[PDB]
Ligand SMILES: *[C@@H]1O[C@H](CO)[C@@H](O[C@@H]2O[C@H](CO)[C@@H](O[C@@H]3O[C@H](CO[C@H]4O[C@H](CO)[C@@H](O)[C@H](O[C@H]5O[C@H](CO)[C@@H](O)[C@H](O)[C@@H]5O[C@H]5O[C@H](CO)[C@@H](O)[C@H](O)[C@@H]5O)[C@@H]4O)[C@@H](O)[C@H](O[C@H]4O[C@H](CO)[C@@H](O)[C@H](O)[C@@H]4O[C@H]4O[C@H](CO)[C@@H](O)[C@H](O)[C@@H]4O)[C@@H]3O)[C@H](O)[C@H]2NC(C)=O)[C@H](O)[C@H]1NC(C)=O
Ligand SMILES: Cc1nnn(Cc2cc(C(F)(F)F)ccc2CCC(=O)N2CCN(C(=O)c3ccc(S(N)(=O)=O)cc3)CC2)n1
Ligand SMILES: [Ca+2]
Ligand SMILES: [Ca+2]
């Protein structure tokens with residue numbers, strides 16, 4: 025119930041929300057059907073439109089008009105945005121030359137530069153260049169301020185997940201808004217775009233920017249706008265809030281536009297009808313900037329121009345139907361479109377089986393345009409599993425396509441020509457970032473970055489401490505003139521042991537053998553030097569990784585590689601080695617094919633054993649430092665130490681062997697040497713965070729040897745490829761991956777072919793940031809370089825995407 029007989033008189037666009045049954049006058053009142061009876065009359069005036077004209081200049085004030093051109097309008101704060109241009113001989117902001125803003129130039133009483141976030145729905149990255157001739161105000165923001173060529177959204181590339189990620193710095197799995205549509209099985213409730221359940225705060229996790237501000241004494245504009253409030257009234261409302269008295273005035277504001285998304289769904293991303301929505305959004309930016317110029321705020325406010333996601337070509341005819349794969353299609357519920365999510369239609373059906381649904385959806389048609397996954401098997405870069413609202417069965421849909429349950433879902437609903445939602449590395453899903461103002465840099469291009477990083481920066485711009493989030497604070501310091509956040513490296517928690525030779529061969533009873541009994545004072549002192557770390561500067565280029573949790577581990581040195589060996593997990597946490605451009609690949613010799621050797625620095629009780637692998641008929645083994653890349657026949661023996669062995673399914677060894685024998689050398693030839701750090705990952709609860717020992721669900725049969733869920737590698741070289749990886753003076757270049765450790769290659773539909781046709785394609789799909797690996801291992805990389813810490817933080821957030829330009 026609402027008692028709509030109250031009045032909005034002196035309350036239009038009030039900032040404090042009033043509680044039912046009292047009637048509302050705020051920018052969301054329409055969306056709840058709760059505005060007072062006179063809200064349209066008083067708060068949504070339209071008389072005489074949005075622009076002054078010559079005849080109106082100097083007019084006697086008429087309170088009915090939408091905006092004013094009377095002499096008193098500047099002091100009331102309610103002039104039309106073009107007033108000074110039409111009536112006082114001023115220029116539009118867009119016609120003024122850009123001039124560096126070295127310091128804030130703010131009116132008296134302003135405690136800090138305000139922040140205005142100008143957000144645009146469906147604004148694809150390439151619009152900034154392709155539309156530049158029809159967007160002069162936006163082009164001036166971009167060219168004069170700080171811009172990225174694009175900004176990466178979060179998966180799924182939908183509106184509700186992305187806007188809430190911008191507001192919170194969190195992945196959707198953590199903030200809870202995992203799609204525009206959701207079922208929560210604990211609540212037994214459904215969230216939808218239409219309807220009232222979406223207003224309940226139980227859906228919305230984390231802490232959004234407006235709340236962070238309010239809790240720390242920084243006042244905020246209300247961010248959400250009811251759809252029927254025209255854009256011109258949204259801008260006038262912001263400008264009026266900026267004329268409030270000092271103690272009442274917000275410091276942070278948001279504008280939102282439904283365009284160009286609305287038209288892009290109808291016409292496609294580059295349909296000829298798309299020019300006009302782009303012109304109109306530019307004209308709105310012009311109104312805002314002219315308005316700021318009138319208030320003497322155009323060299324005081326920080327403005328962010330930012331989008332939620334892009335837009336791809338998609339038509340009804342490019343739809344895959346589950347009714348062409350499943351016998352049982354009426355027993356499932358599908359969340360459809362540019363991603364699929366599947367669950368049982370009834371919880372009382374004990375004949376529902378996820379394994380049979382997955383198998384019926386796997387590599388069944390030659391050009392199949394989606395791929396099924398259990399959520400824990402999705403690329404770790406998507407960070408899309410740790411939430412009860414994400415269904416166990418997921419379909420990753422190819423760009424340009426849809427999935428649906430049955431054909432009648434598609435014509436009892438062609439209309440549309442664009443859509444979005446796909447994998448967040450897809451080029452057409454990329455969106456926009458520009459920052460303009462005293463706190464941003466002047467005429468500066470920055471590299472692409474992820475939208476999860478912006479919350480921290482917005483907090484920096486306002487002097488706020490961020491709530492705990494998924495950004496890496498400091499990684500965007502290169503965007504800012506001042507207000508940078510200067511973090512310190514985390515402290516190492518566990519220090520390593522440095523064991524010497526402590527065990528005789530006969531103390532081991534591991535069931536392993538090796539043909540190594542083959543026998544010199546020159547070379548003996550030399551090999552002793554290698555075991556004490558004489559080559560470590562060659563193979564450990566950026567310091568040892570720091571261990572950020574409590575554990576017991578040993579540093580082990582060798583001619584060709586260095587490792588950090590866990591006494592708890594019975595294997596390395598990390599293994600580090602450098603391969604020059606000139607390095608040679610060799611075979612595993614015939615006599616050494618099944619060789620495994622006890623390590624006389626490590627006790628039998630803290631070693632793996634070969635008998636466990638013999639008896640586990642599903643499990644084999646591989647090596648972290650590859651025997652193929654040994655520096656000499658004599659050094660190759662080190663690669664068969666028991667302390668370099670890890671458990672590997674035979675199907676996974678196909679992938680791993682090809683990476684180590686072929687691809688490492690290819691990268692060294694292409695990048696002028698590479699440093700490689702490889703290791704295991706254990707994430708059985710799919711939370712993106714290092715598992716403790718008591719979370720491990722699978723062991724090599726009959727043993728305490730834990731089975732990794734994934735294997736990583738971090739591959740680093742010199743950004744200036746004229747210098748070799750091991751003699752680099754300047755910035756670094758990195759690519760990394762997190763490969764799923766699976767007992768089949770069912771993910772790769774062409775796996776019966778030679779590895780040259782499918783392995784690298786798999787690895788590209790499972791591309792990763794160094795930061796992703798840090799979360800999954802409790803390790804901290806790049807501790808000893810010549811580079812500034814903020815530069816290293818940027819490096820750790822880089823993702824190699826393998827998309828063309
Ligand atoms: C990205 O950034 C985020 C933010 O930093 C990272 O997320 C944090 O990770 C922590 C570890 O997973 C986690 O810490 C836990 O918090 C528990 C209390 O949480 C409540 O309070 C906080 C603070 O206000 C709040 O944010 C939480 O919000 C979650 O839950 C509500 C609904 O309840 C949602 O609306 C909201 O969206 C959010 O959901 C997300 O997180 C939860 C987990 O909290 C998931 O289950 C959801 O799927 C979703 O992803 C809560 O309101 C606290 O109780 C935990 O402590 C347990 O573990 C410790 C180990 O040290 C143990 O000592 C304790 O005893 C305790 O165990 C007991 O409970 C167990 C479970 O019942 C039981 O089995 C035991 O036997 C014990 O009884 C823990 O400290 C922190 O909450 C989140 N924060 C957020 C916002 O998500 C995220 O990891 C980053 N991602 C990456 C990849 O880096
Ligand atoms: C979601 C979300 N999370 N946080 N925010 C705030 C936020 C955060 C940021 C930011 F600063 F973070 F960038 C910038 C801007 C905002 C305000 C967003 C806003 O005003 N809404 C946009 C999304 N909307 C819709 O898509 C929509 C369409 C149609 C119907 S209907 N008429 O069919 O019912 C309802 C809803 C409604 C308006 N929005
Ligand atoms: Ca959107
Ligand atoms: Ca985990």
Ligand SMILES: [Cl-]
Nearest residue numbers: 054057058059
């Ligand atoms: Cl109403």
Ligand code: NA
Nearest residue numbers: 637640641643
């Ligand atoms: Na075996």
Ligand code: NA
Nearest residue numbers: 769770772775
């Ligand atoms: Na296959």
Ligand SMILES: [Zn+2]
Nearest residue numbers: 146285289444
């Ligand atoms: Zn859309």
